[PDB]
Enzyme design. Structure first.
Site, PDB file in Angstrom:
ATOM      1  N   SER A 137       0.837  -1.202   0.000  1.00  0.00           N
ATOM      2  CA  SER A 137       0.000   0.000   0.000  1.00  0.00           C
ATOM      3  C   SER A 137       0.871   1.251   0.000  1.00  0.00           C
ATOM      4  O   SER A 137       1.992   1.242   0.501  1.00  0.00           O
ATOM      5  CB  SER A 137      -0.958  -0.021   1.258  1.00  0.00           C
ATOM      6  OG  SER A 137      -1.528   1.259   1.551  1.00  0.00           O
ATOM      7  N   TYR A 196      -1.239  -0.435  10.767  1.00  0.00           N
ATOM      8  CA  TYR A 196      -1.162  -0.680   9.324  1.00  0.00           C
ATOM      9  C   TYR A 196       0.169  -0.135   8.696  1.00  0.00           C
ATOM     10  O   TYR A 196       0.890  -0.916   8.109  1.00  0.00           O
ATOM     11  CB  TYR A 196      -2.385  -0.156   8.588  1.00  0.00           C
ATOM     12  CG  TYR A 196      -2.593  -0.672   7.187  1.00  0.00           C
ATOM     13  CD1 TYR A 196      -2.981  -1.978   6.921  1.00  0.00           C
ATOM     14  CD2 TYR A 196      -2.419   0.169   6.088  1.00  0.00           C
ATOM     15  CE1 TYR A 196      -3.221  -2.423   5.585  1.00  0.00           C
ATOM     16  CE2 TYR A 196      -2.692  -0.274   4.786  1.00  0.00           C
ATOM     17  CZ  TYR A 196      -3.024  -1.571   4.552  1.00  0.00           C
ATOM     18  OH  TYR A 196      -3.248  -1.976   3.266  1.00  0.00           O
TER      19      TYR A 196
END
Ligand SMILES: [Cl-]
Ligand SMILES: [Cl-]
Ligand SMILES: [Cl-]
Ligand SMILES: [Cl-]
Lengths: 258, 258, 258, 257
Positions: free
Chosen positions: A140, A153
């Site tokens: 990501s 995350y």
């Protein structure tokens, strides 16, 4: 004749990549915690593209015995492994102040430890057979730039990049290349769509204004779709990208250029 | 039906890319300071791919008049321009203490000013016709990490990166994507071969050991091949990389992973 | 009147930073797994600077109850906290094909989860009392570039950069800044000194060749020393660096310039 | 210790000259406007006294001028310890309308001048065995490409490249080199004059330009001349001896790579 193993294969992005690889001529091991989803996808691939093109397998990528057993099973079924795709991870948002240790530990297990265990096991199979393999992690932009309210995350995704580079260095002598794909927002995905409320509140705007807010930060003025991911994956997985390894490849419509 | 304009197409890497583009289906504008090398390469592509596939052009990419005339000549010859490939620059090695201003200035002219001029003229053609075009710069790992005794080459190549990112931001609204390819050492190229004695001294080793000295720095344990270049180029130039723009794409055998 | 908390303060580099911070005028909370080490260093500091300048505390940074109690203990003792220094974690080397899950896991606990717990609990104190605080992590060049045979270490150190950026973004509104210090090799560390044999073996050379080997990789031709760390730490902890946050600050003698 | 400041005759550059002297430096204040350089050095001389600052003319884009500045500072002061390169102003245009003369100018001022001044002043350091400091004022536009500013970005990225090569070439002499990647200096005369353009560049009213940029910055303010001076002094000091070839962000967290 190549075999692709896709961890996180049973749903959404992972499931598309599975079908995409099958369309491209790979045999596919669809591997997921939910065995039922894995087998249901494998049957759909077989209905769509022909007999024996996919098989379903259960794995908990966070568990060493489970990973070892999947690798044994894949070998028994297909006899080789060429490409490992590791697809996992879901951001759970909270200010650091209120972020739970259980959530932080989970992020690390699912994004880093599973990536490690799957990489270690399948690289062994590639080495055994003299296969100049490929390992590709789904990652990501949050692994390129820290995400506000998403310490678990980002910590996990940054960590993925570090693991991709260590793996590349360890595995290069065997002709195995390793990359992380740094995806922008999958705006139409079921996951993005279900968090439109939560984003509305973090950004101080209406649910219906969230997708335009995010589109407007992308130079190419659109979100990422699954086919963008597949296309990049295909090229890096192919023999034509043999001289590239250890990279963080951006798929962000220009939002990240570093 | 796409047209590729290859600035620096008359020899070595640039010639290899012209031929490869034609192999892939493109009509090719072979543009070069040596019009004779350009016209002859075009003849060779035409005999192998059919009449009218390629044409040779004179250009001095450091000269604004010459570049504007090249863009008009391409337009008159082919309907259009779809891909610009900018291939120029050769490093000259001196410690800063001895580095000449003339050489620093020339490194900027050739590697940067020409990239700017060509990008400018050819983007106007893409915009005119609504082509979702492609601009691809050949760059170097010396545009990712500064290189000792190559201040001129590094300044110019880092510069090219900044230009790429700006061009990407300026043209994204028109669907035009822009990338730099950060190449490793092209150990087999005639330039690299000629310089073996100069690198032998500069390092403090024999000519024969140079290639192994540089090979060893590479995790994949070889030099960059022209084919690696062409492979990466064709991907980023394709409609399969439509959601990638502004990037610095390493082609280094894992020597550079940031 | 500022209070620094140093996690891993009881020996080696941590111990040096505690002394250096007392000298700079800080009250120091020396926190360590070895409580007697923590207490004795604090006694040394009070024997030079006055009673109540330093206190020693036991902490297992990998345990949530032990961290939360440390924060209570420091608050009871000094009534505030201005600077967190997180100094923990060591390198364990093995190629991916022999790298153990226990070690990979431990690397994550010590290098990453400890950093998250400590940042969480001391940020709350900083927030409560309106302090424009500092959080500084001791990291590594292995958090910038992945390390061959050191997957666990790189994964966790990169993950620290990610956590540092997310922390910075979560805490900006409170005037707290967060940095990671990317150290080069502390060649005269006991740690480093004791490992000469293994690097000797790993690399394929006599232990006497090992420091020279790593020195020659540094442009400044010097290993990292504890005072360089202190210097940089003090600057980013000062009110002079208030407009800097989220940074990976290299302290590498030019080895790493990205 | 002697500091040479290029572009020292105005604004941020002037600020930096006043700060270095206050910090204890002898300053050679050098500018294209020699009148400015002379009186800033007397502005400086009426605070910290006499013989402190000296004003010199330089066209940093010109080899002869830069070499004459280097011989003059060696006569005036006997040594050179710190070089600060402060120049460059962004001209905005879409690539499609960007003039070559402007591109060429950006490279000359932002990059060629840095090269020339580092080359000349680094020789003087090597001669006198000095472990000195070269510091460039750069921009976040040298970290991330700026829309409609191809000239300025190409040049400022170039400067990073040059910083790194310089560091590697000058490391054996103990000289360190860095670029400071500044955020927006919102109160500077320059920024203030161009609000109307930034406003029409972004489709906002002028008064709403500054808050649109402040909102981008995690610390929620612009960069201040003093943030610049603070970082410079640290990296210019012997405390930062182990850091070289860096791009140092001063962006309020807007840039973390
Ligand atoms: Cl590579
Ligand atoms: Cl992108
Ligand atoms: Cl910053
Ligand atoms: Cl450094």
């Amino acid at each position: 004749e190549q075999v692709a193993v896709v961890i996180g294969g049973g749903q959404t992005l992972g499931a598309f990549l599975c079908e995409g690889l099958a369309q491209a001529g790979y045999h596919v091991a669809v591997a997921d915690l939910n065995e039922s989803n894995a087998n249901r996808l494998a049957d759909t691939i077989n209905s769509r593209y022909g007999a024996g093109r996919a098989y379903g397998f259960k794995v908990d990528a966070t568990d060493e015995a489970s990973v070892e057993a999947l690798a044994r099973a894949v070998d028994e079924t297909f006899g080789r492994a060429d490409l490992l795709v590791y697809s996992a991870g879901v951001a759970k948002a909270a200010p650091i102040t209120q972020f739970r240790l259980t959530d932080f530990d989970l992020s690390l297990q699912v994004n880093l430890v599973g990536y490690f265990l799957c990489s270690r096991e399948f690289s062994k199979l590639m080495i055994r057979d003299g296969i100049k393999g490929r390992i590709i992690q789904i990652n990501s932009k949050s692994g390129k730039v820290g995400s506000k309210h998403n310490s678990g995350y980002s910590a996990a995704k940054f960590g993925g990049v570090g693991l991709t580079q260590s793996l590349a260095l360890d595995l290069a002598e065997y002709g195995i290349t390793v990359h992380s794909l740094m995806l922008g927002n999958l705006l139409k995905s079921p996951m993005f769509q279900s968090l439109l409320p939560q984003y509305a509140e973090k950004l101080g705007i209406t649910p219906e204004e969230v997708e335009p807010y995010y589109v407007d930060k992308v130079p190419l003025k659109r979100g990422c779709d699954y086919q963008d991911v597949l296309n990049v994956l295909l090229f890096y997985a192919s023999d034509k990208a043999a001289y590239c390894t250890g990279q963080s490849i951006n798929v962000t419509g220009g939002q990240v250029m570093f």
